[PDB]
Amino acid sequence: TMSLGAENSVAYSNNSIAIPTNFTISVTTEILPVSMTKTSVDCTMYICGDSTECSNLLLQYGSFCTQLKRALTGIAVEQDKNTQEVFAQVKQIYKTPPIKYFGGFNFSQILPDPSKPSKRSPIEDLLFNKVTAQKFKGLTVLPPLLTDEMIAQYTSALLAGTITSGWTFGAGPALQIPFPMQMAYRFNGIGVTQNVLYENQKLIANQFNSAIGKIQDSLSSTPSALGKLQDVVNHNAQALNTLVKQLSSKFGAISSVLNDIFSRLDPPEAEVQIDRLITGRLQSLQTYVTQQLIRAAEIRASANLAATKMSECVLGQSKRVDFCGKGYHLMSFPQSAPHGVVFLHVTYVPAQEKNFTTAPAICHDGKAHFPREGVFVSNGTHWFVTQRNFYEPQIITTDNTFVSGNCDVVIGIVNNTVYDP
Amino acid sequence: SALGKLQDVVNHNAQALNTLVKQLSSKFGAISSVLNDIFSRLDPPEAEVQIDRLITGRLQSLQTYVTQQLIRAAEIRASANLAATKMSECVLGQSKRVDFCGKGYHLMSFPQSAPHGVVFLHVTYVPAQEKNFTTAPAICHDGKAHFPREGVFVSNGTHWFVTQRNFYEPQIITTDNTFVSGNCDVVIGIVNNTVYDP
Amino acid sequence: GTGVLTESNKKFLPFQQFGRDIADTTDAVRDPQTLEILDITPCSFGGVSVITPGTNTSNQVAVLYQGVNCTEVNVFQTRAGCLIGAEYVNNSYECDIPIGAGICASYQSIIAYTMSLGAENSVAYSNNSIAIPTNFTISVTTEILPVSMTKTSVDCTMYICG
Amino acid sequence: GTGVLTESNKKFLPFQQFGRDIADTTDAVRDPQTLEILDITPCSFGGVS
Ligand SMILES: *[C@@H]1O[C@H](CO)[C@@H](O[C@@H]2O[C@H](CO)[C@@H](O)[C@H](O)[C@H]2NC(C)=O)[C@H](O)[C@H]1NC(C)=O
Ligand SMILES: *[C@@H]1O[C@H](CO)[C@@H](O[C@@H]2O[C@H](CO)[C@@H](O)[C@H](O)[C@H]2NC(C)=O)[C@H](O)[C@H]1NC(C)=O
Ligand SMILES: *[C@@H]1O[C@H](CO)[C@@H](O[C@@H]2O[C@H](CO)[C@@H](O)[C@H](O)[C@H]2NC(C)=O)[C@H](O)[C@H]1NC(C)=O
Ligand SMILES: *[C@@H]1O[C@H](CO)[C@@H](O[C@@H]2O[C@H](CO)[C@@H](O)[C@H](O)[C@H]2NC(C)=O)[C@H](O)[C@H]1NC(C)=O
Ligand SMILES: *[C@@H]1O[C@H](CO)[C@@H](O[C@@H]2O[C@H](CO)[C@@H](O)[C@H](O)[C@H]2NC(C)=O)[C@H](O)[C@H]1NC(C)=O
Ligand SMILES: *[C@@H]1O[C@H](CO)[C@@H](O[C@@H]2O[C@H](CO)[C@@H](O)[C@H](O)[C@H]2NC(C)=O)[C@H](O)[C@H]1NC(C)=O
Ligand SMILES: *[C@@H]1O[C@H](CO)[C@@H](O[C@@H]2O[C@H](CO)[C@@H](O)[C@H](O)[C@H]2NC(C)=O)[C@H](O)[C@H]1NC(C)=O
Ligand SMILES: *[C@@H]1O[C@H](CO)[C@@H](O[C@@H]2O[C@H](CO)[C@@H](O)[C@H](O)[C@H]2NC(C)=O)[C@H](O)[C@H]1NC(C)=O
Ligand SMILES: *[C@@H]1O[C@H](CO)[C@@H](O[C@@H]2O[C@H](CO)[C@@H](O)[C@H](O)[C@H]2NC(C)=O)[C@H](O)[C@H]1NC(C)=O
Ligand SMILES: *[C@@H]1O[C@H](CO)[C@@H](O)[C@H](O)[C@H]1NC(C)=O
Ligand SMILES: *[C@@H]1O[C@H](CO)[C@@H](O)[C@H](O)[C@H]1NC(C)=O
Ligand SMILES: *[C@@H]1O[C@H](CO)[C@@H](O)[C@H](O)[C@H]1NC(C)=O
Ligand SMILES: *[C@@H]1O[C@H](CO)[C@@H](O)[C@H](O)[C@H]1NC(C)=O
């Protein structure tokens, strides 16, 4: 019987709180397919081949070939529209500065490598390596409009923009900002003050570098991490293969070769036999097209989700919970992949929590003092006020508290002095 | 070409319906495509199979049309759900999601009706005329490090000011708009300066 | 049959006469006159598409054969196929008519070019410099979204029968 | 065929006899006598709810 999870009862009481005293910078991945392979079929040559009176008989059925070709063309252009929507989000190609010092942060594992002939970042190269015949039946694969070089260039431009200019380049002109200051801004976004970053910058840089290395190793050593893209490839390949094997079926006819039937019988029943064969092949092709349409709709939904993720988690900071990775979102970096995109979500995670005794307000001289932004805590003898997401005890004064009424209405108010500077 | 999507909806429906009506004049391997001529030409024993195959073909065409309509309806329903979310989040309020309600910082949007659709006018705030400055993370003063409360420290070359991030409006650095946290020995990049006490 | 017969490296056993493939089609065969091995490859084929600038501007067109090396068919060889009627240009503009594999075609005669990815830019990043706007611009944009399609109904007897 | 016959302004050429719609069904016809031009319109029909 499968285990639901590890049992964990948390100690809840009406005057106890827990405040983290440390954190951990965590990096996660998220693989999303964007586009599937564009295929085109040759109806006249798949259905019949080299027989011309076969085409003459086919012409009497109607314009099924026209409808099939129109549907396939619509899917093919939809794939390119998906790629444009996801990736072509910046109209200017930014470049990283020649010097690669960003206050200790190490971005070599995601920035393009000039040594590689393809100018791809090491993680992009690993992703390409981790993801992997002749059909004369009339089934052809159209090349994508955007080559992998151009997608890599878009990704590099986005990385340079989000490194040198923060999120400003996603809402107007790019404005340069030193990276530690951008990181402080991003902490200030999630309710942790700037001094927290500035006083332990090197520790955070080391944590970020180690997390990036761990992600690279985890992708290298785990073959099932890129499952979704491989599922896309496998689905298309198996669909084409089933379509190919559908040719070796008699469909109830006495034989399954055009020349054999043309040579063995007279027209009066050869016509009926070929009608049966062509009808069967037409139903097979129609089924293939319908499945292609459904799969294309699903892939389009996934591509729209990926475009939203790129707009929100990359070109800015997202307050939505779990949308851009577990924990408090700091920033994310995109990486390209075959028929997909990979996000590296950098996030803030509290750790090393500590229990405390808390009170809703402080009664002093018949007045009730509430915290402006922090929370009242006490190690057991003295009271302090600290921000919620980090332990930074501060003396309770009249500048970090505000007065609201007397101390006769609040439930749980406690007695203490409030220092006045 | 601004209104391409609605016209595409209209064109898709019209062309699908026209394909359905034109397919009605297809032989489907018959001697004739008019059921009346079939009825005035052959014995019922073979008129039966003639009509059978003709009717089966027409029914298959109608089934294909219905399936295409279902797929298009699902796509349009997805678009309509997106439009409802956009209305609720950009019109009935202000959205902080990037690029959801237009390029730039969103202020407000106004809806407009359209044939088989809706049109949004996203009003947005866009910065311009940027100016470079020299910045520092904190200010050291009497052994104390001062950080901005909501602003950012900038310098035009000789004096230091604190200003809001998205607009240039310099102010004198006082203890009102800055807060102290530790000494000025641990932070990297701190700069000496005075802090006016009101 | 119809195809191109080439010398084959296949080496099937003396009792073995024909050769099939995945799709159950004879792709290898042995000459009755002289016991040698041949491969059957279908003659070169592909789809053809027309690059038109619109009849309201000109009647010139550019023909794009798909997936054929045009030594076997103002001529340009792309990854998608061989393009005839348009000349390659070293410059780069935005994509007007997409061909494929990063090639786009436009009318100015008809020209084919590598699409310009974007206006190149480099921002001056340094570790003690910041840029702050001094002015703003109120911008208004549009967004068109379809909501509902046309409600349709059919009459089974009126359509299937007459 | 079944329908309602109305006077038509369609200008048949002297050799033309019938009239076809998009679906290749007779729409306008010329009566054998009086050599007149007519339209064929199906009788009223619709759904019931
Ligand atoms: C803070 O104190 C509370 C209670 O004083 C701790 O809750 C107990 O933790 C121990 C540790 O294993 C458990 O065995 C007890 O069952 C908990 N109490 C209850 C009522 O469940 C809490 O763990 C302390 N915080 C930290 C971080 O240690
Ligand atoms: C917060 O946690 C970090 C690690 O998560 C602590 O840093 C470690 O400190 C010990 C002792 O100083 C070193 O041996 C380790 O090498 C450090 N880790 C890293 C990754 O550098 C840090 O000390 C914690 N802070 C507090 C206040 O407890
Ligand atoms: C940033 O990270 C890269 C990659 O980890 C570091 O490159 C390493 O450099 C050392 C010595 O220079 C070599 O022994 C390693 O083999 C390099 N790693 C790889 C994967 O080649 C680099 O030193 C780090 N720091 C900077 C400033 O780039
Ligand atoms: C709770 O915190 C206060 C403030 O740090 C502690 O009071 C100080 O404790 C240290 C260490 O014992 C002394 O050196 C200081 O003189 C104390 N300051 C004052 C004003 O008394 C207090 O001890 C802490 N409580 C507990 C139980 O650790
Ligand atoms: C907080 O301070 C107030 C006033 O100093 C305390 O109120 C007194 O409580 C005692 C004990 O019941 C009474 O005898 C006095 O008459 C009260 N005086 C006033 C002005 O209310 C209050 O008890 C203190 N809080 C706690 C928890 O003891
Ligand atoms: C930076 O800004 C300060 C504040 O405006 C400038 O200081 C003033 O400059 C004007 C014109 O030079 C003088 O009239 C004022 O008397 C100055 N005020 C003080 C308190 O000295 C400063 O000149 C600016 N620096 C540069 C390089 O333009
Ligand atoms: C910022 O100010 C502090 C204090 O005024 C300077 O620290 C002094 O530096 C000099 C030369 O480096 C030493 O001789 C003194 O002993 C230092 N005094 C103290 C109290 O630290 C510091 O150098 C200044 N920094 C800058 C960049 O101006
Ligand atoms: C603010 O100053 C910096 C440097 O003082 C400017 O950066 C230079 O801008 C020029 C403009 O053409 C470029 O040619 C240089 O290459 C830039 N320097 C570097 C190192 O790249 C910056 O442009 C100024 N800000 C504004 C708005 O003009
Ligand atoms: C911010 O930009 C606006 C326009 O984008 C500037 O307003 C213009 O000012 C000039 C000079 O006074 C006038 O000739 C124009 O007619 C104004 N434009 C409009 C639309 O009214 C404005 O001056 C800029 N801000 C600053 C501080 O210069
Ligand atoms: C606090 O909790 C204890 C036990 O959980 C309970 O007996 C007491 O009534 C509670 N008091 C308040 C003020 O919540
Ligand atoms: C086939 O017959 C010709 C004469 O007609 C002869 O020259 C040739 O050697 C024969 N081929 C073989 C393989 O025996
Ligand atoms: C800024 O970077 C330069 C090299 O790019 C370095 O010499 C300088 O020390 C850095 N400044 C700070 C404050 O780290
Ligand atoms: C010929 O047709 C016309 C049509 O109105 C009719 O009036 C006339 O009597 C017909 N002639 C004969 C001989 O029936």
UniProtKB/Swiss-Prot annotation, chain C:
What does the record say mutating S122L does?
A: In strain: Omicron/BA.2.12.1
Where does it reside? Answer: Virion membrane; Host endoplasmic reticulum-Golgi intermediate compartment membrane; Host cell membrane
Please give the residues the UniProt entry marks as glycosylated. Answer: N56, N69, N90, N127, N135
Question: Which cysteines in this chain are paired by disulphide bridges?
Answer: C70-C82, C95-C104
Q: What happens after mutating T134I?
A: In strain: Alpha/B.1.1.7
According to the record, mutating Q66H results in:
In strain: A23.1
Biotech and industrial use? Main component of the anti-COVID vaccine Chadox1/AZD1222/AstraZeneca; in which the human tPA leader sequence is added in N-terminus to enhance protein secretion.
PTM section of the record: The cytoplasmic Cys-rich domain is palmitoylated. Palmitoylated spike proteins drive the formation of localized ordered cholesterol and sphingo-lipid-rich lipid nanodomains in the early Golgi, where viral budding occurs.
Family membership noted in the UniProt record: Belongs to the betacoronaviruses spike protein family.
* Misc remark: Variant D614G has become the most prevalent circulating sequence in the global pandemic since April 2020. The mutation is associated with higher viral loads produced in cell culture and animal models. It would not change pathogenicity nor neutralization properties vs vaccination. May be prevalent because the mutation increases virus transmission in human population.
Its UniProt domain note says: Contains sequence and structural motifs very similar to those of a bacterial superantigen and can directly bind and activate T-cell receptors. Activation of a broad T-cell repertoire may be involved in the hyperinflammatory syndrome in acute COVID disease. The KxHxx motif seems to function as an ER retrieval and binds COPI in vitro.
What is the protein name given in its UniProt record?
Spike glycoprotein
Gene designation: S
The residues of the intact protein that this chain contains are 548 to 744 of 1273
